[PDB]
Amino acid sequence: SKGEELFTGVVPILVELDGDVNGHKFSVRGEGEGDATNGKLTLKFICTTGKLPVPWPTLVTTLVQCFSRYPDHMKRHDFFKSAMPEGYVQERTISFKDDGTYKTRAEVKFEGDTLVNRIELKGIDFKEDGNILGHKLEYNFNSHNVYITADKQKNGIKANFKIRHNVEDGSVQLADHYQQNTPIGDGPVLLPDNHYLSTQSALSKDPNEKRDHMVLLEFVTAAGITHH
Amino acid sequence: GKELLEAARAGQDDEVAVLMARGAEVNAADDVGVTPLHLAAQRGHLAIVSVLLAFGASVNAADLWGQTPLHLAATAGHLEIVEVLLRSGASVNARDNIGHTPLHLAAWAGHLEIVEVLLAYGADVFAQDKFGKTPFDLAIDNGNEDIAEVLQRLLECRRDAEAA
Amino acid sequence: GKELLEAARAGQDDEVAVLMARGAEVNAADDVGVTPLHLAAQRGHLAIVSVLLAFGASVNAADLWGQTPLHLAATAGHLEIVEVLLRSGASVNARDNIGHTPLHLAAWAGHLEIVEVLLAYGADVFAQDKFGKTPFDLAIDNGNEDIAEVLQRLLECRRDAEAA
């Protein structure tokens, strides 16, 4: 449980994404700070490969759920800090309704004293006048709930949720997500109970920037096991 | 210029006194807008906050994420820093990017005396945020029990006063 | 505390701002009435004078011999200390026990620019002392050459203006 105790203060975070969508490659390097005692994430991402092909709100969920606030009477159900400092692997299949899809593989682990998250993304089957890559998505993001259950066969967790993205004309595009989180260590982890995780976030822009970027603030908590 | 912030992050109070004896700007932000006061406001460092404040400092300096020193000192739980920040003219109704006020964060984390201070310095209860929730909601859906109690007391007091 | 006077007496800037980061009374006198500002006014420091002044200090505190920081800084010859002391509200017409003004001592030591500054800050020429002598007398009986010239220029100008 030392992996739980190491999150006691601020932790600096660096994240690197190498993505390729329809042969169109790009990178996203993000830096920032995170507080796991109170579930706060303050990050800033920059595209180091020129103009971004894909709207930012689709990539936010790809771009560290070990920084979620668990209350004390639910400390028995914290899987993610149990898998530290060795790390773990996350597999996501992202289904965009009536469009193409994403497949993403990520590794989350400490390097030195910095939590790095590496991510390889492959997106296919999107129509060239689709509202995703036609740049019709709005620059705001909503609050959500994510449902989590155990898996003793892979000794990790299965995760599902469904995101509503905002379009210009008031329409709503839905993206479903499938996710597996499995450790790379072999020691003991915490097998959690069936519960959910609530999320608020805010996207913004930096005034004195010239590159393509995004500034993100996020709050995440967990609930479902409503014990006294 | 840039070896000031390092000594605030790090708890090196004597190095702060040495840099303040010489000429050094207290209002310095590196890449994001963040100040030695912001850094000494996250981690309690009552001595460094007081010496940065006595030499004159932006008490309400906008972070890139919209945060001010009061937000960080209310999130962390340092009561004395919140007292000395409020006595020096900090605004109790400053907003976060998500829409949070300092009372929202104080109710979210679960500090009681900080809520009692912010309520005694002019913070209002039923102020919404961008997603639409009041501090009472954050208090009830995060297991904080007596924060929700004094908030429900204030709501019932206002509602029963309006019913006449 | 009482460790501060060693600090300013020494020239130890860093050990002055450390003691001032803590709680320390600037208005402290050990056996004779003498202040850390008095000690940094006798010897020359600009840095300790400015940091003791920014933390709030009695700019004109009477020594046992009646001296203020301005008397000591005018006798010694530190020009920048006299400028920063005069800008902070020091009185130019404080009197010594023997009756001297800061202009008397500046004329006695022989600093020209300090005389020009004190003349520009409201010190008068023909002010007596207890033995009855003006600064012009001290200039003539102490080998200071140009001091006596600008003093006689001002005296003759006033006398010839009264003659009409």
Residue numbers in the entry:
A (entry chain C): 2 to 64, 68 to 232
B (entry chain A), C (entry chain B): 54 to 217
What do the study authors state?
In this study, we present a novel DARPin–apoferritin scaffold, with a larger size of around 1 MDa and higher octahedral symmetry, meticulously engineered for the binding and imaging of small target proteins via cryo-EM. Our most efficacious constructs, namely models 4 and 6c, feature a designed ankyrin-repeat protein (DARPin) rigidly linked to an octahedral human apoferritin via a helical linker. The 24-subunit apoferritin framework allows the attachment of up to 24 target proteins without steric hindrance, an extraordinary feature. The modular design of our scaffold allows the adaptation of new DARPins through minor amino-acid-sequence modifications, enabling the binding and visualization of a diverse array of proteins.
In higher resolution regions, the β-strands of GFP, the α-helices of the DARPin and the side chains of the residues were clearly defined in the sharpened density map. The atomic details of the β1–β3 and β7–β11 side chains, along with the backbone, are essentially clarified. For β4–β6, aside from a few amino-acid residues, the majority of the main and side chains are also clearly presented. The GFP chromophore and its adjacent amino-acid residues were detailed at near-atomic precision, setting a new benchmark for cryo-EM imaging of small proteins [Figs. 3(b) and 3(c)]. The attachment of GFP to the DARPin induced no significant alterations to the backbone structure, with a root-mean-square (r.m.s.) deviation of just 0.646 Å.
